[PDB]
Write a protein that binds this ligand. Structure first.
Ligand SMILES: Cc1cc2nc3c(=O)[nH]c(=O)nc-3n(C[C@H](O)[C@H](O)[C@H](O)COP(=O)(O)O)c2cc1C
Ligand code: SF4
Ligand code: SF4
Ligand code: SF4
Ligand code: FES
Ligand code: FES
Ligand SMILES: [Ca+2]
Lengths: 148, 156, 905
């Protein structure tokens, strides 16, 4: 993207300058917390910070900072290219847009699919993951990871 | 007696070029030293502190905070097996038992010849293909206890 | 702001958080990780209360009172069942890994964790698993380390790094294996590391000097006193057990030294417990040393003083105002000589003239932290006035404070303040002959000789105001740095100029006065701070008198056949050979002292004076504030043969026996009234402390706590009969527990802080009007002088630049917090912390002499050849050699002098 003019100085001749870096972490789970992420980005221990102030007001090195997930930033260009009216008409639910959902653990197809919001968990388990394996019966499930 | 190499020092300065504060290159400086020498020795903390202009106490606290920065000597290859909830469901304990049988060591220890260092680690982000093991740079999925000693012979 | 705590209405400050507001109202909320001087972080999760949205709310939510502002119309509950249960649960979680260590822990009975465990009501253990353990580190001779007792409250790292600016202490590790200490075994390098024994709420950091002869807090006899190890005058609480000074605690003074002392004051008290101290009056008769009691000592001294034709008295800046005044009355005003050299006296009188005649306000030690730019000229503040350096660090962080204040962030939310003001700081410009300990935060550092530092100050004053004398011969790089300093100082609302007499240059003080006058002429709120040398240097300068050299000429010419030296070794202010010859020529030498000095061999009479632990008196600190120190213990309580009196008592009894041949000792208030009547410049010392008739509802003030123990067994080996309790006719304190130490008592002198449920140093919160503010009924001490209406004129004596002459070496002064003070080197625990005696050389000078680093070179001063090893000082200017002042064999008057035949031995 830097060779193609999509990054660096004078992006698309519009005067906007943007530099993108990859900061490879050193293996600690608490670094995903956004204020702990800011502290880890500054070369400190990844202790989180009390809010207020939120990182939008004073984040990385005291400057205004916005932290977003990979999937939100992947949802952004589809909104900017196809429009708002397409994004609001993806699903007839309160939460607009699609979401990466999937089932894991002793199922027939443990995987990852992109589904609209409002998709029930039985379709993810049975119509996509194939249901439980042979000789195993369903007992419980966690919807959104280890912290749910 | 520790001395930073020229390539290590130049990589560290190129890392501090990326940030507005030289303190922000401490993690990557420790990772550069770890990649060059396998681990981070005692004098490396003072060397990185002298290059970065921050106190050595903060560098030591950063090195001891992060699990992937090793402040104790490890073997030539580091096996990191996932022990989180999905791989517990997929049965990482058979993999751990096979690893302890083949290497004759407990987790957190080093083989007598310095070839392997066995370590538990958190979720590797490969839960749909669990259980997962992470040797030095390569992640191996769909593990079975029978394939463990076959997999371990390709890391001399 | 209006808050409602448990249904009761309170009026508080809306800028405060809920924890400090509720502690200021007398309410009890447990807390660990919050400190008034350090701010709120929300770590220990102990200060939880239940906040309600409105008045008609029942559910509420658990919030943290240190992290919640005490805004108007707030509704909280402390005694709510869920809040109490959560606080007990937090204490229980802290108690899961705590070692069973209280009997063998130096924090026992003085522990904040003990008080909060009892306060939360947690006394039943149901945790049945193992407890984590930690190895300990060697942190040096002053601090003892025991990491098993840690509760991970992060007070030590926050104080040591954010507040004190230290670098070698930190937090390491992870989830429950957090370690607090140094990265490796070694001595803690901060000059204020000793405050960790009061900052830490547990026994992780402990006073090792106290841990040698350890006794509990309830067994201590405490007094309110003033630290005598430099001129800052920090308020201390000396505590004694079994006739020896056991500990020095920080006594809260919101105007001076609120929560923190320096290491020299905290650990340099060991000279009091020396076994070679004089305990009885001794008279020399040939080769015999006859021990007398006080009456025959006064009779004999009266006869020999009456037979003499002219008696002279040599005072000291170590002694109090009353003792120096008593010597001055005994020998006469014209025969009274200050015990300091002529150059030292000239610098001290110039500093006094600047302070009380320059028309510029002199800030207190707490007021220094509110200044917007700091220029330090010549004075190594960290090594001579260390608490001023700590306050300078706080004033430097004031820029981050105001940057966070501009973003509507509360002043107690310290993490957001440090995040917003990342590395921006108020301008600090320090000048010295070498590197200082303020170089890490200084905007600029000028390593130059004292003439060049004075010329830099004169050029700054000329560039600020063109009426000041100009300096010719400024290099363009130096002119650019001068322009940077001038642009910083001119744009500051509250500039501060700090100088002192330790630089050994009159012109440095003149340049600092010129800078302060130039900043005052522009309408700025400039303050000036002069750092003196000893505890009562300012008082001795105000009292005045001749120099030591004039007294030595009076002894050598035979005009004075009797000399009375009061608490002065006389070798730090003049050459030793001249002093010894002048004292050996005099047929009567009487040394009134509490330390075994080198001039006592020639002394015909030695009076066993009292130190600060065994005497009352008044000392004037560097800002001109008179402060009364009180006697801690009776020396003659244990050893009945010990005749050790106050110095003013000794000299007043001597004067009475000389005049009327009868022995009357004094009362202390009589000496105070005599000082006020005779010296109108010292008339403010009457209001420093109330007199000996002051009572709190009829009772005196207790020196020892109400649970003092052993009263029928402390002296049982000497005699099974209990002796008479020592009576204190001098002051309002009593040598017993039968007194008043209530936190609500109408007084300013507090011997020690204790409240029911608060046995730790956190009882000072109960002893304040608001937490972190002043004492409830005013801080002790009164300024002797106000700011004058009109100022001085510009000092036109601009010195010439430093020219390195061949064969002569200018002695650059080097000061050390451990070693430069006269009494602190006598403390045996300092010798491990005292540096080896080296000499500093430039690389060019060492290459010219052909000497390396570590080799021994010999130099002759006043016909005395002494050899020292060599370090290579890079920042030292060529033509100068660096000597450590106040050391063994190196008198502080050598600063600014010249050296001959400095060559390799
Ligand atoms: C303990 C903890 C760990 C977290 N780890 C991550 C993480 O690994 N990745 C992530 O995107 N958000 C993580 N978060 C959530 C972030 O705080 C934040 O919501 C996110 O980084 C950005 O918000 P967004 O969803 O609007 O993009 C974590 C939160 C907590 C409390
Ligand atoms: S720190 Fe306090 S609670 Fe811990 S062992 Fe010492 S006295 Fe007991
Ligand atoms: S060592 Fe003391 S001050 Fe430091 S975190 Fe532990 S308990 Fe708190
Ligand atoms: S700064 Fe001076 S007065 Fe204060 S504790 Fe230190 S030596 Fe004592
Ligand atoms: S749980 Fe093992 S890879 Fe995620
Ligand atoms: S004092 Fe408030 S959480 Fe520690
Ligand atoms: Ca007395």
């Amino acid at each position: 993207a830097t060779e193609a003019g999509l990054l660096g100085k004078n992006i698309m001749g519009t005067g906007f300058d943007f530099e993108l870096f990859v900061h490879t972490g050193a293996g600690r789970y608490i670094c995903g917390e956004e204020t702990a992420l800011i502290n880890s980005l500054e070369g400190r221990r990844a202790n989180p910070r009390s809010k207020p102030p939120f990182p939008a007001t004073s984040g990385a090195w005291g400057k205004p900072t916005c932290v977003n997930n990979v999937e939100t930033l992947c949802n952004v260009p589809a909104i900017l290219a196809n429009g708002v009216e397409w994004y609001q008409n993806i699903s007839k639910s309160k939460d607009a847009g699609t979401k990466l959902m999937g089932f894991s653990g002793r199922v027939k197809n443990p995987g990852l699919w992109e589904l609209p919001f409002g998709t029930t968990a039985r379709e993810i388990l049975e119509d996509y993951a194939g249901g439980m394996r042979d000789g195993l019966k369903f007992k419980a499930w966690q919807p959104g990871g280890a912290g749910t | 007696a520790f001395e930073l190499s020229a390539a290590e020092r130049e990589a560290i300065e190129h890392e501090m070029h990326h940030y507005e504060d030289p303190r922000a290159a401490s993690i990557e400086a420790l990772k550069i030293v770890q990649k060059q020498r396998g681990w981070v020795p005692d004098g490396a903390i003072h060397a990185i502190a002298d290059v970065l202009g921050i106190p050595a106490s903060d560098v030591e606290g950063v090195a001891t905070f992060y699990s992937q920065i090793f402040r104790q000597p490890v073997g030539r290859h580091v096996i990191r097996y996932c022990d989180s909830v999905v791989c517990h469901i997929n049965g990482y304990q058979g993999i751990q038992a096979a690893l302890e049988k083949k290497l004759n060591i407990k987790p957190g220890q080093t083989t007598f010849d310095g070839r392997f260092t066995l370590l538990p680690t958190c979720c590797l982000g490969n839960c749909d293909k669990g259980p997962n093991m992470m040797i030095d740079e390569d992640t191996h999925a769909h593990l079975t206890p029978e394939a463990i000693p076959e997999l371990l012979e390709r890391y001399k | 702001a209006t808050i409602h705590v448990d249904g009761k209405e309170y009026e508080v400050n809306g800028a405060d958080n809920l924890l400090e507001a509720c502690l200021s109202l007398g309410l009890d909320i447990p807390y660990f990780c919050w400190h008034p001087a350090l701010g709120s972080v929300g770590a220990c999760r102990q200060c939880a209360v239940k906040q309600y949205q409105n008045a008609e709310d029942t559910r509420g939510r658990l919030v943290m009172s240190c992290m919640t502002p005490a805004s108007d119309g707030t509704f909280i509950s402390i005694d709510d069942e869920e809040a109490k249960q959560f606080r007990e649960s937090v204490v229980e979680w802290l108690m899961t890994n705590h070692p069973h260590d209280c009997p063998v822990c130096e924090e026992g009975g003085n522990c904040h964790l003990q008080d909060m465990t009892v306060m939360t009501g947690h006394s039943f253990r149901r945790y049945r698993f193992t407890k984590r353990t930690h190895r300990n580190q060697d942190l040096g001779p002053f601090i003892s380390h025991e990491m098993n007792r840690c509760i991970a409250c992060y007070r030590c790292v926050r104080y040591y790094k954010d507040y004190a600016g230290g670098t070698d202490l930190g937090v390491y590790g992870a989830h429950d294996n957090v370690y607090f200490g140094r990265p490796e075994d070694g001595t803690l390098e901060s000059e204020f590391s000793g405050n960790l024994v009061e900052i830490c709420p547990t026994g992780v950091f402990t006073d090792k000097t106290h841990s040698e002869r350890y006794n509990r807090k309830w067994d201590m006899q405490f007094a309110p006193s003033i630290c005598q190890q430099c001129s800052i005058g920090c308020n201390i609480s000396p505590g004694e057990r079994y006739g020896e000074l056991r500990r020095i605690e920080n006594r809260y003074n919101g105007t001076v030294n609120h929560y923190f002392l320096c290491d020299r004051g905290r650990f340099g008290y060991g000279y009091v417990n020396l076994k070679d101290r004089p305990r009885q009056p001794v008279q020399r008769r040939g080769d015999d040393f006859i021990t007398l009691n006080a009456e025959q000592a006064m009779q004999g001294a009266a006869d020999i003083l009456r037979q003499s034709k002219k008696v002279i008295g040599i005072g000291s800046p170590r002694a109090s105002v009353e003792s120096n005044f008593a010597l001055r009355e005994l020998v006469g005003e014209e025969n009274f000589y200050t015990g300091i050299a002529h150059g030292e006296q000239e610098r001290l009188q110039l500093a006094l003239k600047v302070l009380r005649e320059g028309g510029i306000y002199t800030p207190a030690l707490r007021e220094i932290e509110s200044y917007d730019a700091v220029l330090v000229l010549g004075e190594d503040v960290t090594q001579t006035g260390a608490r001023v350096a700590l306050a300078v660090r706080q004033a430097v962080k004031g820029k981050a404070r105001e940057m966070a204040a501009a973003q509507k962030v509360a002043d107690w939310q310290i993490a957001a303040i440090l995040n917003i003001g990342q590395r921006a700081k108020h301008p600090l410009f320090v000048t010295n002959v070498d590197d200082t300990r303020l170089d890490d935060i200084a905007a600029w550092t000028y390593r130059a000789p004292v003439e060049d530092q004075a010329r830099l100050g004169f050029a700054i004053a000329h560039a600020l105001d063109n009426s000041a004398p100009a300096v010719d011969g400024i290099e363009p790089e130096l002119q650019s740095k001068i322009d940077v300093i001038v642009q910083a100082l001119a744009g500051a609302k509250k500039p501060l100029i700090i100088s002192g007499t330790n630089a050994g240059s009159l012109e440095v003080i003149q340049a600092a006065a010129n800078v302060a006058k130039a900043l005052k002429g522009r309408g700025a709120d400039v303050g000036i701070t002069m750092i003196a040398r000893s505890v009562n240097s300012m008082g001795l300068g105000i009292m005045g008198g001749g120099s030591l050299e004039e007294a030595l000429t009076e002894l050598e010419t035979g005009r004075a056949d009797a000399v009375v030296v009061l608490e002065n070794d006389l070798h730090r202010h003049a050459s030793a050979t001249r002093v010894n010859a002048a004292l050996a020529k005099a047929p009567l030498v009487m040394v009134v002292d509490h330390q075994r000095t080198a001039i006592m061999e020639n002394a015909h009479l030695v009076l066993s004076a009292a130190s600060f632990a065994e005497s009352d008196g008044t000392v004037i600190n560097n800002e001109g504030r008179a402060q009364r120190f009180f006697q801690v213990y009776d020396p003659a309580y244990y050893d009945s043969k010990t005749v050790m009196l106050e110095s003013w008592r000794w000299l007043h009894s001597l004067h009475s026996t000389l005049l009327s041949r009868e022995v009357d000792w004094t009362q202390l208030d009589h000496v105070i009234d005599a000082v006020v009547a005779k010296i109108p410049e010292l008339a403010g010392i009457k209001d420093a402390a109330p007199d000996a008739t002051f009572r709190i509802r009829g009772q005196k003030l207790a020196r020892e706590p109400h649970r003092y123990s052993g009263r029928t067994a402390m002296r049982a080996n000497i005699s099974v009969h209990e002796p008479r309790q020592p009576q204190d006719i001098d002051t309002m304190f009593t040598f017993s527990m039968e007194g008043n130490n209530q936190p609500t008592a109408h007084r300013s002198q507090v011997p020690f802080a204790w409240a029911p449920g608060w046995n730790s140093p956190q009882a000072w919160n109960k002893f304040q009007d608001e937490v972190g503010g002043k004492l409830r009924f005013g801080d002790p001490g009164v300024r002797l002088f106000e700011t004058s209406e009109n100022g001085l004129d510009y000092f036109t004596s601009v010195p010439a630049r430093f020219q390195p002459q061949d064969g002569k070496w200018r002695i650059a002064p080097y000061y050390h917090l451990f070693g430069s003070d006269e009494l602190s080197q006598r403390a045996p625990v300092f010798q491990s912390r005292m540096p080896q005696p080296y000499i500093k050389l430039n690389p060019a000078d060492a290459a010219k002499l052909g000497v390396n680093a570590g080799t021994r070179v010999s130099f002759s001063y006043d016909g005395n050849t002494v050899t020292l090893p060599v370090e290579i000082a890079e920042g030292l200017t060529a033509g100068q050699v660096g000597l450590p002042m106040g050391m063994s064999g190196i008198a502080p008057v050598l600063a600014g002098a010249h050296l001959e035949d400095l060559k390799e031995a």
